[PDB]
Each structure stands twice: as C-alpha cells, then as structure tokens.
Amino acid sequence: DMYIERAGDITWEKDAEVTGNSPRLDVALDESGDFSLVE
Amino acid sequence: GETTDGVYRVMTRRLLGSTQVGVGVMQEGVFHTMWHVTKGAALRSGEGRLDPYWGDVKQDLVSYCGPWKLDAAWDGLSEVQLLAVPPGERAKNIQTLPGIFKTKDGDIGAVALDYPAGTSGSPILDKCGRVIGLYGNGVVIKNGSYVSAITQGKRE
Numbered sequence A: 001d002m003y004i005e006r007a008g009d010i011t012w013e014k015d016a017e018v019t020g021n022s023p024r025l026d027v028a029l030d031e032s033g034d035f036s037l038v039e
Numbered sequence B: 001g002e003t004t005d006g007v008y009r010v011m012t013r014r015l016l017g018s019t020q021v022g023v024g025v026m027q028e029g030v031f032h033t034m035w036h037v038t039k040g041a042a043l044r045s046g047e048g049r050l051d052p053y054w055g056d057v058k059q060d061l062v063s064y065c066g067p068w069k070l071d072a073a074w075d076g077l078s079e080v081q082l083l084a085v086p087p088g089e090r091a092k093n094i095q096t097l098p099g100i101f102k103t104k105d106g107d108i109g110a111v112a113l114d115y116p117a118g119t120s121g122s123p124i125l126d127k128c129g130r131v132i133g134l135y136g137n138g139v140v141i142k143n144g145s146y147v148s149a150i151t152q153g154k155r156e
C-alpha cells in the first residue's frame, strides 16, 4: 500500500541555486504517454 | 489524514525498506501526481484513504479525492523553479529557464534537470508560487542527460 508524507510548502525561494540549460527539441508523444526525440 | 496544501512524498513498503516512488501536490483537498508514480492505485494518508478520481495515461497525470485543480501555465519567457523532492533528501528549490518540446500538437515548456526517478511528480512553480506543472515525464538526450516536460492538467 502506497502512502504519502508531507515534505514542504510550495513557495518560490529568493536566491535559489540557478542551473540547467534551455534546449529546443522536436519530440513525439505516443498513446502510452512516452516522449521520444524526432530527428 | 493530512489534507494541508503542500508537496508530499509518495512511498511504498512493497520493496526493501521504505522506498520513495514519487512526489505529488495537495491543493484544494485534491492530491495531484503523475500516473506512472501510482499506476492509479489507492493511497494512504495516516489512517485515511485517498481514492483516484481522474487519470489519463497519455497525459501521465492522476488526481485523488477530486478533479484536477492546477491550472497555472508557464509564460514562455521567465525562469521557473523545480521544487525537487528527491528520495531521502530535503525539498530544495532549483531555478532554471525552461527549454521547449516542439510537438505536432503544439509546444510545451521543458526543464533540463537531473534527479532520481522517485523525484517524479515534483512541482514546477512560477514566481507567484503557482504550480505550472509536474516534473517526471520526458526524454533522454544526445549526451545521456534528462529533460522533463512541464506536464500540466486541465481544470474542468
């Protein structure tokens, strides 16, 4: 049996760590909810 | 059970010890997570039971106790925050500028951040603290890195 436990409030944090790039990708979404790259 | 708004871990005791299989959002008395985290199974909150109310495998979303309530959208311009809730680790905000998934049915925001699979369902937020979607359904790219769609439901 799966169970849930609270982990925090949902709030924006000022001066959070900033990372990650912003790729623009061509993708396909199938009937099973899987994304795949189109090339 | 606990019904306070917030981000929650989704755990199971089926495997070794207590294992985190994902994360979700409690808002307006409804629990929101990705379909692949629970497979649509019922959940426990203390002595209370949460039954599935709506779900869709293609969207990879599911709501419990009521209809999907989250309706904020990425503005397509600004940085957002992933409120990552990794297994065994404290909730932590990570700021990023989303990229884009371009599909035959329109464009979706996407976040290029790497976390364990049990982080799926963690919320992505705008600067007003609104949940614009959930992290955890995406693709593996050319260098082995992970890029998640910003997956959002529809408030009926």
Ligand SMILES: CS(=O)(=O)c1nccn1Cc1cscn1
Residues within 6 Å of the ligand: A019, A020, A021, B094, B112, B113, B114, B115, B145
């Ligand atoms: C490409 S990226 O910078 O989004 C990334 N690469 C590995 C992990 N993450 C996110 C991250 C970096 S430090 C804490 N979290």
Ligand SMILES: CS(=O)(=O)c1nccn1Cc1cscn1
Residues within 6 Å of the ligand: B086, B114, B115, B116
């Ligand atoms: C991505 S992972 O599976 O190595 C991982 N294990 C625990 C947390 N993370 C994510 C992380 C934070 S900073 C670099 N990696």
Ligand SMILES: CS(=O)(=O)c1nccn1Cc1cscn1
Residues within 6 Å of the ligand: B114, B115, B116, B117, B118, B119, B120, B135, B136, B137, B139, B140, B144, B145, B146
């Ligand atoms: C890059 S991957 O998809 O092969 C992966 N392997 C371990 C974790 N994840 C990433 C993840 C985070 S939330 C859903 N999936």
